[PDB]
Enzyme design. Structure first.
Site, mmCIF file in Angstrom:
data_model
loop_
_atom_site.group_PDB
_atom_site.id
_atom_site.type_symbol
_atom_site.label_atom_id
_atom_site.label_comp_id
_atom_site.label_asym_id
_atom_site.label_seq_id
_atom_site.Cartn_x
_atom_site.Cartn_y
_atom_site.Cartn_z
ATOM 1 N N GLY A 51 0.818 -1.200 0.000
ATOM 2 C CA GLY A 51 0.000 0.000 0.000
ATOM 3 C C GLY A 51 0.854 1.252 0.000
ATOM 4 O O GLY A 51 1.957 1.253 -0.551
ATOM 5 N N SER A 80 5.361 -6.076 -0.658
ATOM 6 C CA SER A 80 5.699 -4.650 -0.703
ATOM 7 C C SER A 80 5.957 -4.074 0.690
ATOM 8 O O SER A 80 6.752 -4.620 1.461
ATOM 9 C CB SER A 80 4.570 -3.875 -1.387
ATOM 10 O OG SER A 80 5.071 -3.063 -2.432
ATOM 11 N N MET A 81 5.304 -2.967 1.011
ATOM 12 C CA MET A 81 5.483 -2.374 2.329
ATOM 13 C C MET A 81 5.263 -3.434 3.415
ATOM 14 O O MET A 81 5.937 -3.424 4.451
ATOM 15 C CB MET A 81 4.512 -1.208 2.519
ATOM 16 C CG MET A 81 4.936 0.061 1.782
ATOM 17 S SD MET A 81 6.558 0.635 2.358
ATOM 18 C CE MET A 81 7.617 -0.168 1.168
ATOM 19 N N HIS A 105 9.130 -5.674 -4.628
ATOM 20 C CA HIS A 105 9.290 -5.057 -5.941
ATOM 21 C C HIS A 105 9.647 -3.581 -5.795
ATOM 22 O O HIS A 105 10.235 -3.174 -4.787
ATOM 23 C CB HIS A 105 8.020 -5.237 -6.785
ATOM 24 C CG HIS A 105 6.800 -4.612 -6.192
ATOM 25 N ND1 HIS A 105 5.572 -4.650 -6.814
ATOM 26 C CD2 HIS A 105 6.624 -3.896 -5.057
ATOM 27 C CE1 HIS A 105 4.693 -3.980 -6.091
ATOM 28 N NE2 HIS A 105 5.306 -3.511 -5.020
ATOM 29 N N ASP A 154 8.364 -7.699 -10.161
ATOM 30 C CA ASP A 154 7.726 -8.550 -9.162
ATOM 31 C C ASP A 154 8.587 -9.756 -8.823
ATOM 32 O O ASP A 154 8.896 -10.557 -9.697
ATOM 33 C CB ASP A 154 6.354 -8.999 -9.666
ATOM 34 C CG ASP A 154 5.278 -7.945 -9.446
ATOM 35 O OD1 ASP A 154 5.619 -6.844 -8.971
ATOM 36 O OD2 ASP A 154 4.091 -8.206 -9.737
#
Lengths: 174, 6, 174, 174, 174, 174, 174, 174, 6, 6, 6, 6, 6, 6
Positions: A51, A80-81, A105, A154
């Site tokens: 996000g 991600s985060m 990524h 990715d």
């Protein structure tokens, strides 16, 4: 609520896409516990697709400030985060379950308008990507150039792979 | 998720 | 709630876009808090994208009216009016965390209709831009000219950059 | 509720566009507070863009009817009918914070159908200007014609220009 | 609720368009108050645009049936069927505030189909218009041959004209 | 609730169009009141534009099953299925207020598909048209062939015309 | 709630389209009642237009599993899986009110895509139509061949025809 | 709530499409019940059309961690990821009712963009299809070659076909 | 709505 | 709204 | 819905 | 919002 | 869903 | 976020 119950035992739960709303909630929790006892450790369970960059940094910053060690557990997906936060946990206390996944990524964004405006958004996102990458290296033990090429696109990984990359320290079995 | 988280 | 809980210890949260309702809510909580003990200091946490100029001004005007010292902490992102409100905190008591982000820029608006009508709106928004830049000048310490040039377009600054520009006083470490 | 703690000390908050609903509720609280004690004064804080004409008048006729003096406070912005109600507070008790804003303009409406039907819509709205314009004239000191021309198009004023035009009595500094 | 307090003292609030739901709520309350004590009077405050002809009649009839005298206060605006219920208050107990507005016209509707289906709708609405017009000449004292031409097109009236017309009895001031 | 109180004195409110949800609530109530005392009677107040033919029967069939006598009051409008239920009140206990309105007509529906499926439908509705007209014949004293021709199209009746038809028993006045 | 009171006397209500939620609900209520006292009877009232085949069967299966018997009542309409759960009540304990309706037919579905995919759906629905027709045979007493030629198209039945066919055991009268 | 009483006796419900939310709730509940008594067992009732592969793996992974043996009961349907977990129950404690349905198939997903991007997606998708098939084959006892071919398209199985295939251990009759 | 409903 | 309603 | 359910 | 409202 | 779940 | 806010 079932979560208020797990809270009496020091357990915060991050299990949704990260937006400001979530970020704030998880921050006030880590603060509430640290006050109840600056000794007993706390545990944060994670299952998210990532996000907002700014939103996760809020979280990432409170885990550092408080006295009590913060341990992490990957349940489901940490992307991600979300995967960033997982690695952010206390050295020696970063866990993942047998069939969890971890994806890393590069930052996503957008820009529309005059040449000059499109330029401003571009400089910022490049800067963030850079900041995020340097911390990823210090948490994993991986050199920068690696965390740089490995995130070009990715990059999904399995629990045994995350353990190898150094994003977690142990896998909970039974 | 204990022994040991808590 | 955990937030209701934060009010128990004199803490208010500004973690969403600034609109009339949000503004009206925070205005009353300062009023109430200052009424219980016009001595103990109050703590306002900020994680906002910004919002309405008029609404953000109500909040500001109230922090200056009450007797308790209102300190401000930037968590995550303080942009547009939010950055403005963070800067309005009690001098020596404006904080931020290692990875917080701050962005300043100029007001946004729009106009439609006959030449005369467009002329009126233009006057209002140029006027508002003025009032705002001046307060920032006084609160930060920079000269009006500098604030004028620096907000022509989006201007993103890190916690270190914001401290050096005079928007906050200290960074909270651990 | 937080505003419930406010009604306990005789304070009413009008912070939204004005429509029959919002109007009815404020009318009630006004009657409730006066019934509990016709000697103590009441306070009406304002932060609204305005709204329906007839809904404004109902609130206005109520402030007038009761015995307790009703003081007004403009925080943020008071536009059109909202600015009209501010002006109706007890002479000597009409405040406005440092950065408040005030806006006055003519009514808005529409007509559709036969020439005869359009004409009826014409006569009503032109009358509503005269009625609303005479009251504001008495409340400020400005003669009707001046109110006429000055509200021909949108007219936004600062806290300092509202004090002069005659819409408020004092600015609450610190 | 704030109205939970006004009922506690025999006050009913009709402040919205008149449809079945509202008409059923106002009926329930009237009956309850006539029940707790059939002597004390009951007050009905009105501020409405109008609505279903049948929904209003439902309220018009409950006022007639119960024992307690029902007083009417127009707070803001009473148009069409609302104007009708204000005038239906107990002779001598029909109130209006100074800047209130009252409006009377003829019934509105539509019909789509065969000549036979159109004819069926034509007759029903003309009857209603004739049933309303008579009850108005009786509550005002105006001759039917006048109510007929005065409601041909939208007719707006101030509190004073409403009194000169016989729709209200007194004008509450202070 | 205001209705939570009426049911304490054995009164049920049917003030919405009839659909499965509405109908299922009414039935469960008639069965509750009969359980608290199969001697005291029950009252059903009606004001609806009608609704589902199968939802109406459900209510109608529970009215018959229980021991308590049921009185029906029309307040406002009782059309189609609403008018049907009204006519189903205990003989001698079916009322209606002065300006109440009643409407009776033939059922509505639709068919789309093969000639075989359009036929299957035409037969269902024409059969239900007949089952209702038979219960109406018995309850009004009017014969089937008349109930039929009289409802071929929308038929609106006054409280006086409903009384002469055999739909209600007495007109409550004051 | 009203339905909570009914559960106190062992009465469950199925009055809505049948979908996975409805199903997960009925199931547990039956399990709770049989937990408290495995000897007392339990009752299921019905007014459903039908729905999901897989959901309907979740209820059916639970009915047969518990010791307590389950008597069924059709109030209103019982079509498709609705009429099905009716017929699945304890033999000798299946009721329906005087004007209730029962409609049995063949399953409905869809297939979109390749020739092979369309065939996989064709096969699954023709299977379910067979498993359902057989159970209807056992419960009613009708020979399978009679059930297959009768559920070919929408088949609507009166309570009298439901009892004749063998779907219900007894029609509850006054 | 009805479902609250369920947890109080160690019965968790999974009756909806599996997503990150339903997943986190179920995980916590499992860990809670393991706390109160690591000895007594827990039951997982199922009726779900499937869902996210990652949401599903968390549920599965937690069932394996806690000390209490977890039983599973398929009710209604158990498609895709739903049937998987169903098979994840303690050997000898996996159930399903007589008319329950179970379905297995291969993972679903999408990809858009550059050839390189669609590749990354193809690799992840095929990889999950591989991990799912291998655990299925260890739980059922069936050979991998069979699981692979049998899941090329939607495969619907009756409760008897479920027992024989190795997905469950016993059917609950009465 | 008594006299007489109740 | 008294004197006099109530 | 008794006599006889309950 | 006192001194002086209240 | 006992005997035996619980 | 103490020491020192609170």
């Amino acid at each position: 609520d079932i979560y208020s119950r797990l809270l009496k035992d020091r357990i915060i739960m991050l299990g949704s896409a990260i937006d400001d709303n979530v970020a704030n909630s998880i921050v006030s929790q880590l603060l509430f516990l640290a006050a109840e006892d600056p000794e007993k450790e706390i545990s944060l369970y994670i299952n998210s697709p990532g996000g907002s960059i700014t939103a996760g940094m809020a979280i990432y910053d409170t885990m550092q400030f408080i006295k009590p060690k913060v341990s992490t557990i990957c349940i489901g997906m940490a992307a991600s985060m979300g995967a960033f936060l997982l690695a952010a946990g206390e050295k020696g206390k970063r866990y993942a379950l047998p069939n969890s996944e971890v994806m890393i990524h590069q930052p996503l964004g957008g820009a529309q308008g005059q040449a000059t405006e499109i330029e401003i958004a571009a400089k910022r996102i490049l800067l963030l990507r850079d900041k995020l990458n340097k911390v990823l290296a210090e948490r994993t033990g991986q050199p920068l150039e690696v965390i740089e090429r490995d995130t070009d696109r990715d990059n999904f990984k399995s629990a045994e792979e995350a353990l190898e990359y150094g994003l977690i320290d142990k896998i909970l079995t039974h | 998720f204990s022994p040991x988280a808590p």
